[PDB]
Ligand binder design. Structure first.
Ligand code: WMS
Ligand code: WMS
Ligand code: ZN
Ligand code: ZN
Length: 583
């Protein structure tokens, strides 16, 4: 305990020797509280003007406008230790699942070279400012790496000095860049080498992309079974048990040499024992500790969430199939039965699921799954917005299943070929495009973010009448050659490019689409179909409203307003790619 965190604590305590005070009115119960010290400082959303000026009808939709305005009593929760039978079910399943993921993969260390490219082309690794300004600067230096080396040698010693989280249903724990590297060195392979790919994991979708998710849900639908189940967990990261953290750590069993010790240290020191600096305006910096809950990089979090979610869902399948009778204790015969289930049908059972971190869709063997709730509830993976022992409401139609904030439509092209297209409430799409994260943006940068959104809409949401039109308008209003930008790059972002959008559509939807047998390129945008105009209205379209018809009719005037603001640049008119504007 304090042997493992004390060094980290004692080091912080000393850098504020004229401040340290053990405030006796600290609000922590579930989190251990060590002390405090003096600080004073805070990033709200800004509106993207290029997008808003070209989406005027939406200036009066409260669902769009409210998205741009404005529980920490959930992070301070505690989950009960699972029963012995639950713990055995999890240990056995975790062992078998690491083996399966490892069959065609080699754990390996990631390198500074790799980490250095990441920071120069910008991911969201989540660092802090201090001694160097940006993340870009500290990597270019040589002193930072000497710091890294020190901590690394300490990790091999089995101690830790500077790996401390900073808190800030979305609470992010940013770490200093050095700690991020040591985490990425040890565990980056999980993301970098696609361990949770559909090919390697059977349930996973890592790197598959929105244009593939709908086809994958449909492939699951083709299996014999009962309803499709899509239970969200109530605050998944706050319900990761120490038992989950120990079963994740069994990935080190597949490692060797330096890598194995470095990985064990990350699991032992930064995951199974955590030290966090949280601000408290009453402004002190509280130094609290905790062994449980999900702390890690957003990207290792994703891989370990997918892993533990796969594990829980295999066990819920086992329960619905009556592989084990009770979670209180597992008979020696029940252990063998579980083990032989995994060996005999485990891979088939994984192919019945689509899992993206804390998000899942299961098509179990039959509807017994709906009331198989004892293992799920005991593991602490308590379902959101339904009573604890109330049976799951399944879905009969794969086109109604929620997954990764989307639903999927089946859409028939004029030539018989079949698109499965992603979709969500259009107010959600327009409200997100109207928002820029960070201030300090030039007109040019703001314009290039709008163009990223426009190109995503043309690629993913082309079947929505208002999004094809607004996307054509934004791309007409931003200089033809200006490059699309984004301040967090997830899966596959084929819209981040200066190439012709019809050429990308053809590559993504026809050429590279393994569900399309005929590879005939499409020759214009008019070949590319829309949802039915009632289906479009159901998913939030403004077609049929007066405000919308005036906007479409007078779009060239909105385009010209934005062209005037940006200035005398080279523009393309994309509106004639649509039938109604083609004279
Ligand atoms: C790291 C990931 N790999 C695939 C994912 C599936 N989810 C998704 C959501 N939004 C846009 C996407 F391209 C994909 S998440
Ligand atoms: C219920 C409605 N019936 C026709 C409408 C007009 N909206 C529209 C726009 N572009 C292409 C279309 F097929 C239809 S709204
Ligand atoms: Zn450390
Ligand atoms: Zn829809």
């Amino acid at each position: 305990n304090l042997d493992i965190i004390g060094k980290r604590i004692e080091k912080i305590k000393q850098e504020h020797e004229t401040s340290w005070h053990y405030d006796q009115d600290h609000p922590y119960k579930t989190w251990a509280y060590h002390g405090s010290y003096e600080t004073k400082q805070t990033a709200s959303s800004m509106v993207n003007g290029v997008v808003r000026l070209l989406t005027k009808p939406w200036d009066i939709i409260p669902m769009v406008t409210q998205m741009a305005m404005t529980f920490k009593e959930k992070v301070d929760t505690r989950t009960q230790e699972p029963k012995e039978g639950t713990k055995k079910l999890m240990k056995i399943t975790a062992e078998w699942l690491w083996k399966e993921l490892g069959k065609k993969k080699t754990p390996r260390m990631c390198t500074r070279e790799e980490f250095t490219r990441k920071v120069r082309s910008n991911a969201a690794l989540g660092a802090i400012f201090n001694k160097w300004k940006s993340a870009r600067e500290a990597v270019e230096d040589s002193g930072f790496w000497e710091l890294v080396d020190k901590e690394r040698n300490l990790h091999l010693e089995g101690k830790c000095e500077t790996c401390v989280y900073n808190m800030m249903s979305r609470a992010i724990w940013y770490m200093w860049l050095g700690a991020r590297f040591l985490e990425f060195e040890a565990l980056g392979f999980l993301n970098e080498d696609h361990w949770f790919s559909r090919e390697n994991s059977l349930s996973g979708v890592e790197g598959e992309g929105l244009h593939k998710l709908g086809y994958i849900l449909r492939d699951v639908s083709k299996k014999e079974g009962g309803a499709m189940y899509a239970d969200d967990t109530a605050g998944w990261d706050t319900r990761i048990t120490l038992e989950d953290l120990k079963n994740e750590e069994m990935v080190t069993n597949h490692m060797e040499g330096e890598h194995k010790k470095l990985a064990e240290a990350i699991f032992k020191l930064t995951y199974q024992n955590k030290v966090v600096r949280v601000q408290r305006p009453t402004t002190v910096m509280d130094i609290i500790s905790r062994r449980d809950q999900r702390g890690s990089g957003q990207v290792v979090t994703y891989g370990l969430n997918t892993f533990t979610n796969m594990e829980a869902q295999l066990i819920r399948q086992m329960e619905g199939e009556g592989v084990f009778k009770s979670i209180q204790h597992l008979t020696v015969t029940e252990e063998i039965a579980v083990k032989n289930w995994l060996v005999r049908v485990g891979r088939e059972r994984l192919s019945r699921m689509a899992i993206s971190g804390d998000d899942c869709v299961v098509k179990p063997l039959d509807d017994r799954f709906a009331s198989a709730l004892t293992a799920l509830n005991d593991m602490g993976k308590v379902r959101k917005d339904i009573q604890q022992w109330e049976p799951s409401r399944g879905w009969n139609d794969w086109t109604q299943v929620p997954f990764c904030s989307h639903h999927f439509h089946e859409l028939i092209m004029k030539d018989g070929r079949v698109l499965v297209v992603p979709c969500r409430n259009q107010d959600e799409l327009i409200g997100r495009a109207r928002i820029s994260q960070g201030a300090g943006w030039s007109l040019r940068e703001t314009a290039c973010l709008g163009k990223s959104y426009a190109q995503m809409w043309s690629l993913m949401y082309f079947h929505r009448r208002d999004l094809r039109l607004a996307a054509n308008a934004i791309c007409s209003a931003v200089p033809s050659h200006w490059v699309p930008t984004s301040r967090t790059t997830h899966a596959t972002h084929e819209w981040m490019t200066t190439e012709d959008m019809l050429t990308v559509w053809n590559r993504v939807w026809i050429q590279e689409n393994p569900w399309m047998e005929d590879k005939t390129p499409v020759e214009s945008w008019e070949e590319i179909p829309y949802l039915g105009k009632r289906e479009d209205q159901w998913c939030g379209s403004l077609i049929g409203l007066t405000s919308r018809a005036t906007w479409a009719k007078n779009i060239q005037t909105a385009i010209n307003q934005v062209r005037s603001l940006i200035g005398n640049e080279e523009y393309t008119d994309y509106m004639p790619s649509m039938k109604r504007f083609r004279r």
